[PDB]
Amino acid sequence: MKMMFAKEQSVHNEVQAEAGASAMLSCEVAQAQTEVTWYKDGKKLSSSSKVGMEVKGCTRRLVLPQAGKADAGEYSCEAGGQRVSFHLHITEPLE
């Protein structure tokens, strides 16, 4: 049991942005680091060539430095008892 409590990165609000903008919805577990089944509406998690999905030793972080039209939608994450609610209303000025 480590006392390294990370700053709460588990977003839970509705924020908008532009196309190619930088959206950030990361989930960090500082307790019984349980695997969390995360999914976004429109973005399918692959390797890393498309979006910037990295796997942290502790939890996982959904870094998307290009919030686009196809990235707009609702984000639902089911963590060990905790959850993330991040609604991104992105714009389409680019492509």
Side-chain angles (χ1 to χ4, degrees):
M1 301 301 290
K2 299 182 179 180
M3 40 173 279
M4 187 177 184
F5 181 90
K7 57 184 183 181
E8 282 289 339
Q9 283 287 299
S10 51
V11 189
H12 63 267
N13 70 359
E14 177 172 340
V15 170
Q16 56 180 41
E18 293 81 355
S22 66
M24 290 177 187
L25 27 160
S26 38
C27 206
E28 193 68 4
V29 181
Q31 48 181 30
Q33 47 186 36
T34 303
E35 183 177 16
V36 314
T37 305
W38 62 352
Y39 277 85
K40 200 215 286 155
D41 292 352
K43 148 176 171 66
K44 184 174 64 158
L45 277 62
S46 182
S47 287
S48 280
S49 186
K50 305 286 184 177
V51 179
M53 324 80 78
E54 293 292 350
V55 183
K56 206 176 181 178
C58 308
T59 328
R60 297 174 63 180
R61 299 176 64 186
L62 212 82
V63 195
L64 337 88
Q66 198 171 340
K69 186 177 182 292
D71 288 348
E74 176 176 342
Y75 178 62
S76 171
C77 193
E78 283 179 0
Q82 292 173 325
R83 62 183 179 215
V84 175
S85 188
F86 174 75
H87 293 82
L88 42 157
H89 298 283
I90 320 175
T91 331
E92 63 199 298
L94 307 175
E95 294 178 357

